[PDB]
UniProtKB/Swiss-Prot annotation, chain A:
Present with 1150 molecules/cell in log phase SD medium. It is found in: Nucleus. It comes from Saccharomyces cerevisiae (strain ATCC 204508 / S288c). TFIIE is a tetramer of two alpha (TFA1) and two beta (TFA2) subunits. The gene is TFA2. This is Transcription initiation factor IIE subunit beta. Recruits TFIIH to the initiation complex and stimulates the RNA polymerase II C-terminal domain kinase and DNA-dependent ATPase activities of TFIIH. Both TFIIH and TFIIE are required for promoter clearance by RNA polymerase. Belongs to the TFIIE beta subunit family. The chain holds residues 275 to 327 of 328 of the full protein.
Curated annotation (Swiss-Prot), chain B:
It is found in: Nucleus. Component of the 7-subunit TFIIH core complex composed of XPB/SSL2, XPD/RAD3, SSL1, TFB1, TFB2, TFB4 and TFB5, which is active in NER. The core complex associates with the 3-subunit CTD-kinase module TFIIK composed of CCL1, KIN28 and TFB3 to form the 10-subunit holoenzyme (holo-TFIIH) active in transcription. An additionnal subunit, TFB6, plays a role in the dissociation of the SSL2 helicase from TFIIH after transcription initiation. Interacts directly with TFB6. Residues 167-321 form the Helicase C-terminal domain. The chain holds residues 423 to 837 of 843 of the full protein. The gene is SSL2. The lineage of its organism: Eukaryota, Fungi, Dikarya, Ascomycota, Saccharomycotina. It comes from the Eukaryota. A motif (DEAH box) lies at residues 66-69. Belongs to the helicase family. RAD25/XPB subfamily. Disruption phenotype: Essential, it cannot be deleted; epistasis studies suggest it is involved in damaged DNA excision repair. This is General transcription and DNA repair factor IIH helicase/translocase subunit XPB/SSL2. The modification Phosphoserine is found at S330. Present with 825 molecules/cell in log phase SD medium.
Curated annotation (Swiss-Prot), chain C:
Present with 35900 molecules/cell in log phase SD medium. It is found in: Nucleus. InterPro entries: TFE (IPR039997), TFIIE/TFIIEa_HTH (IPR017919), TFIIE_asu (IPR002853), TFIIEa/SarR/Rpc3_HTH_dom (IPR024550), Znf_RING/FYVE/PHD (IPR013083). TFIIE is a tetramer of two alpha (TFA1) and two beta (TFA2) subunits. One of its GO terms (molecular function) is RNA polymerase II complex binding. The gene is TFA1. Residues 243-264 are annotated as: Disordered. It comes from Saccharomyces cerevisiae (strain ATCC 204508 / S288c). This is Transcription initiation factor IIE subunit alpha.
UniProtKB/Swiss-Prot annotation, chain D:
Component of the general transcription and DNA repair factor IIH (TFIIH) core complex, which is involved in general and transcription-coupled nucleotide excision repair (NER) of damaged DNA and, when complexed to TFIIK, in RNA transcription by RNA polymerase II. In NER, TFIIH acts by opening DNA around the lesion to allow the excision of the damaged oligonucleotide and its replacement by a new DNA fragment. In transcription, TFIIH has an essential role in transcription initiation. This is General transcription and DNA repair factor IIH subunit TFB1. Component of the 7-subunit TFIIH core complex composed of XPB/SSL2, XPD/RAD3, SSL1, TFB1, TFB2, TFB4 and TFB5, which is active in NER. The core complex associates with the 3-subunit CTD-kinase module TFIIK composed of CCL1, KIN28 and TFB3 to form the 10-subunit holoenzyme (holo-TFIIH) active in transcription. An additionnal subunit, TFB6, plays a role in the dissociation of the SSL2 helicase from TFIIH after transcription initiation. TFB1 interacts with XPC/RAD4. XPC/RAD4 recruits TFIIH to the NER machinery. Interacts with the NER 3'-endonuclease XPG/RAD2. It comes from Saccharomyces cerevisiae (strain ATCC 204508 / S288c). Present with 5150 molecules/cell in log phase SD medium. Belongs to the TFB1 family. It is found in: Nucleus.
Length: 42, 353, 304, 34
C-alpha cells in the first residue's frame, strides 16, 4: 500500500497485518434466596 | 454533579477521602471532601497531612457546606476557621437540632437567606404531595402490664414490639404493595427491623450488613417488582443512595429528633410519579397508644407542622376483621412474643505457638 | 451478485488465461466458481494428483493468487487431519496483478532504453563482453582493430541495437494484449474493494459435491496470540370491543391510583382495630316480493 | 420456528409443523445466511 502510494498508483487494499496494528461474599437474606435476580445492568 | 451539570473538567475536580487523596495541579480548581477530613484530630496519614496543609495554605473564595445542620458539632464547627474561605453557603434540607446550637450557624455561616415554601413547591409539581399520617396502635393488655414496671431502654424495647403495630405494618405493606407503591419502612432498632423482616419475609438493611448486599438488595427494590418493601435502619436516615418510594412506614424512632423525620420524608419527596395528576405520596408514623410514642412523635411532628404538613390521625384500619394473614392474632403468640422480648435482655521457635 | 465481484473474477480469468497454462486456469476457475474449496474437494473436482497440484499450488502461492487457510477440525471418528482450504483475497490479488504488470512494463521499458546503446564488441575466443568505452584501450598500433587482452585476437561486433525495433514491436505487442487488464483496473479504481477473508468468502460458497470430508465451519480458539410486523383488521363491527377495553383500563388505573377508604373517611366512630318479529319480517318480505311481482439431533432453540 | 444463538458453535435450524409435527434440520455455513 505505502509503496504504491509512493509510486503514485493509489491502492485498492487496506493495509495488511504486517503493518502496525492493534469475588464472592456472604448473604444475610437466606430465607428467600434464589429469588433475588442478578442486576449487573440497569 | 459538578462533572454533569457544570463545565468543570475532571482535572479541575479533586477528591479528599480515605481511598482518594490526589488533587488538581492547576492554580485554581475544585475539591470535594468529607467533614472529618478536616476536623479529625486523630493520628492521620502523611498524605492527608500534606493535603490539609495544602487546603490551609490555599486561599478559597467559596465553600459549599452541604448538610449544614451538623456543622455546629464540636469538630465540625472548626472547619470554617481552619479553611479560610471568603463565601460560605450552608445547604441543607433539615435546619433543626435537638440542642440549641442550630442558632449558632449565624456566627458559623451567616444570616438565613432563603426559606422554600413546602406547600408551594408541592402544589406546582416540584416536590411530592405527601400524606402525613399517624397510626394509633392500642397497647395490648399483657404488654402494657409488663410495661408499667420497666426501665426506659427496656420500655422502648417493649413498646416497639407490640403486636398491634405488627398487624398495622403488615396491613399497610399488604395494601400499598397492591397499589404499586415502593415502600421504605424505617425502624432504628436493629432488633426491631430484623424481627419485622423475619416476620414478613422482607429484606432488611441495618448497619453491619455488607455493602454489596446493600447494593444488590437496593437494585432489587429498585427494579425487581417482586420486592417492594425494604426495612431500613438509622443508616437510611442519613445520606445513602436509595430508590424512589411513594409510601413510608415509621415503626420505631430515635426519640423526638426533629432532623430525622424530614430526612426520612425527603426520600419520599423525590418521587417520580409527581407529574401524574391525582398522585399522593404516603407517610406513616406508627405509634403505640398510651405509651411514650405520642410524646416522642409530637416532638417529631412539631417541626413538620411548623413547616405546614398535616398528620391525619388514624385509629382504625379497614381490614383487620378480614385480613388474610394475621400476625400475633392468638393470645398465645402474643404472650410468646412478650416473653421473647423479656428474654431479649527467634526464627525456629516461632513454630511453637 | 456484486458487479465488482464480476469485474475481479473477469480480471483473474483474463490474467490466468494470459500468463498461465491450462491447469492454472482450471485451478483458478474452480476457485472463482466454488468460492471456498479444500484439497480433497479439489482432487475430486479436477482429478488432479498431489505431485501434479504441487507445482500448481506452489505457483499460485508464489504469485500470490490463492489465500490458504490452516484449519483442523474434529470429525466424529476422531481422525482429525490438518486440512487446507483455498480461497481468494480480492484486494491482495489485484494488488499483486498491479505490481506484476507494473514491473513487467518497467522491465521492458528498461530493455527498450538499454537497447538504444551501441553494439559494442566481444571476443569470440574468450567469449567476454566489451562495451564501447573499453574498446578504445584495446586498440592496436595499427589503429584499426581491437585486440583482446587475454586471447590477443581482434574483437567482433555484438548484435545488440539492431533489435531495438524488435524490442519496440515486442513492447507494443505486449501492450495491445494487456489493455482489458488496464480497463478492469481502471474500473476497480473507480469503485471500492471490500477486503474479504475466509469467514466472508464462506458467504458465497458453492458445494463441490454432496459429501465433503473437510467441514466449512470455523472453530475458534482461546489464548492464540498470532423485527416483526403484526396487523389487526377490523370490519367496522368490533371497534366497540377495544374502546370498551380502553375505558375499562382507564377506570382500572383510576381505581389503582384512587385514594384509599380510610384516608377519605373518618375512622374514629367505627370499631377498633384487632384480629317474534322474524315471522313479521318474513311476511313483510313475502309482501314486497308479491308487490314486485305485481309491479313487473437436539440442541438449544429459540422461538420467533 | 427454531434457531440457534450466535454464541453457540453448534449451528442448527429446526422447523415445527402442525397436524405429529414434521421436523426438518437445516445446518448452514455462514451466520449472515441464517
Ligand atoms: Zn578474448
Amino acid at each position: 500500500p505505502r509503496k504504491l502510494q509512493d509510486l503514485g498508483l493509489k491502492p485498492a487494499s487496506v493495509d495488511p497485518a504486517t503493518i502496525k496494528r492493534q469475588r464472592k461474599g456472604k448473604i444475610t437474606n437466606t430465607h428467600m434466596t434464589g429469588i433475588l435476580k442478578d442486576y449487573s445492568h440497569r | 454533579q459538578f462533572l454533569q451539570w457544570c463545565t468543570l473538567q475532571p482535572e479541575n475536580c479533586a477528591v479528599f477521602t480515605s481511598d482518594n487523596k490526589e488533587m488538581f495541579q492547576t492554580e485554581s480548581g475544585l475539591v470535594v471532601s468529607t467533614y472529618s477530613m478536616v476536623a479529625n484530630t486523630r493520628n492521620r496519614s502523611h498524605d492527608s497531612q500534606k493535603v490539609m496543609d495544602f487546603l490551609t495554605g490555599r486561599e478559597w473564595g467559596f465553600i459549599i457546606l452541604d448538610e449544614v445542620h451538623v456543622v455546629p458539632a464540636a469538630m465540625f464547627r472548626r472547619v470554617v476557621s481552619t479553611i479560610a474561605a471568603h463565601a460560605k453557603l450552608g445547604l441543607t434540607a433539615t435546619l433543626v437540632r435537638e440542642d440549641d446550637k442550630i442558632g449558632d450557624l449565624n456566627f458559623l455561616i451567616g444570616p438565613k437567606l432563603y426559606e422554600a415554601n413546602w406547600m408551594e413547591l408541592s402544589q406546582k409539581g416540584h416536590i411530592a404531595n405527601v400524606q402525613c399520617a399517624e397510626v394509633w396502635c392500642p397497647m395490648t393488655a399483657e404488654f402494657y402490664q409488663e410495661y408499667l414496671r420497666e426501665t426506659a431502654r427496656k420500655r422502648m424495647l417493649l413498646y416497639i414490639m407490640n403486636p398491634t403495630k405488627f398487624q398495622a405494618c403488615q396491613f399497610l405493606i399488604q395494601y400499598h404493595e397492591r397499589r404499586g407503591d415502593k415502600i421504605i419502612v424505617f425502624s432504628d432498632n436493629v432488633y426491631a427491623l430484623q424481627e419485622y423482616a423475619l416476620k414478613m419475609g422482607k429484606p432488611f438493611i441495618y448497619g453491619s450488613t455488607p455493602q454489596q448486599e446493600r447494593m444488590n438488595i437496593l437494585q432489587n427494590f429498585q427494579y425487581n417488582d417482586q420486592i417492594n418493601t425494604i426495612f431500613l435502619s438509622k443508616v437510611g436516615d442519613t445520606s445513602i443512595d436509595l430508590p424512589e418510594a411513594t409510601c413510608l412506614i415509621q415503626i420505631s424512632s430515635h426519640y423526638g429528633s426533629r432532623r430525622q423525620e424530614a430526612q426520612r420524608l425527603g426520600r419520599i419527596l423525590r418521587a417520580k410519579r409527581r407529574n401524574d395528576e391525582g398522585f399522593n405520596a404516603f407517610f406513616y408514623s406508627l405509634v403505640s397508644k398510651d405509651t411514650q410514642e405520642m410524646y416522642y412523635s409530637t416532638k417529631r411532628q412539631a417541626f413538620l407542622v411548623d413547616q405546614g404538613y398535616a398528620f391525619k390521625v388514624i385509629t382504625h384500619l379497614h381490614g383487620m376483621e378480614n385480613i388474610p394473614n394475621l400476625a400475633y392474632a392468638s393470645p398465645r403468640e402474643r404472650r410468646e412474643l412478650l416473653q421473647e422480648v423479656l428474654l431479649k435482655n527467634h526464627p525456629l521457635i516461632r513454630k511453637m505457638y | 451478485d456484486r458487479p465488482i465481484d464480476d469485474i475481479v473474477k473477469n480480471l483473474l480469468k483474463f490474467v490466468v488465461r494470459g500468463f498461465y497454462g491450462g491447469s492454472f486456469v482450471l485451478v483458478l476457475d474452480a476457485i472463482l466458481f466454488h468460492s471456498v474449496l479444500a484439497e480433497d474437494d479439489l482432487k475430486q473436482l479436477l482429478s488432479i494428483n498431489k505431485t501434479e497440484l504441487g507445482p500448481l499450488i506452489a505457483r499460485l502461492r508464489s504469485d500470490r493468487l490463492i489465500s490458504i487457510h490452516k484449519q483442523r477440525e474434529y470429525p466424529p471418528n476422531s481422525k482429525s487431519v490438518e486440512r487446507v482450504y483455498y480461497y481468494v483475497k480480492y484486494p491482495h490479488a489485484i494488488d499483486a496483478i498491479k505490481w506484476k504488470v507494473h514491473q513487467v512494463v518497467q522491465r521492458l521499458k528498461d530493455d527498450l532504453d538499454k537497447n538504444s546503446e551501441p553494439n559494442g564488441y566481444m571476443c569470440p575466443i574468450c567469449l567476454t563482453k566489451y562495451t564501447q568505452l573499453e574498446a578504445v584501450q584495446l586498440l592496436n598500433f595499427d589503429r584499426t582493430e581491437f585486440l583482446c587482452s587475454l586471447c590477443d585476437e581482434p574483437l567482433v561486433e555484438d548484435d545488440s541495437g539492431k533489435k531495438n525495433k524488435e524490442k519496440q514491436d515486442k513492447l507494443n505487442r505486449l501492450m495491445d494484449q494487456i489493455q482489458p487488464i488496464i480497463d478492469s483496473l481502471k474500473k476497480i479504481d473507480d469503485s471500492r474493494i471490500e477486503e474479504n477473508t475466509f469467514e466472508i468468502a464462506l458467504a458465497r460458497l458453492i458445494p463441490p459435491q454432496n459429501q465433503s470430508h473437510a467441514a466449512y465451519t470455523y472453530n475458534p480458539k482461546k489464548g492464540s496470540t498470532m423485527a416483526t410486523l403484526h396487523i389487526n383488521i377490523t370490519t367496522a363491527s368490533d371497534e366497540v370491543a377495544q374502546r370498551e377495553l380502553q375505558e375499562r383500563q382507564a377506570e382500572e388505573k383510576r381505581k389503582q391510583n384512587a385514594v384509599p377508604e380510610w384516608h377519605k373517611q373518618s375512622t374514629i366512630g367505627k370499631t377498633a382495630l384487632g384480629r317474534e318479529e322474524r315471522e313479521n319480517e318474513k311476511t313483510l318480505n313475502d309482501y314486497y316480493a308479491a308487490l314486485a311481482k305485481k309491479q313487473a439431533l437436539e440442541d438449544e432453540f429459540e422461538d420467533v | 420456528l427454531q434457531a440457534t444463538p450466535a454464541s453457540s458453535e453448534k449451528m442448527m435450524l429446526r422447523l415445527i409443523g402442525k397436524v405429529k409435527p414434521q421436523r426438518h434440520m437445516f445446518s448452514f455455513n455462514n451466520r449472515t445466511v441464517m
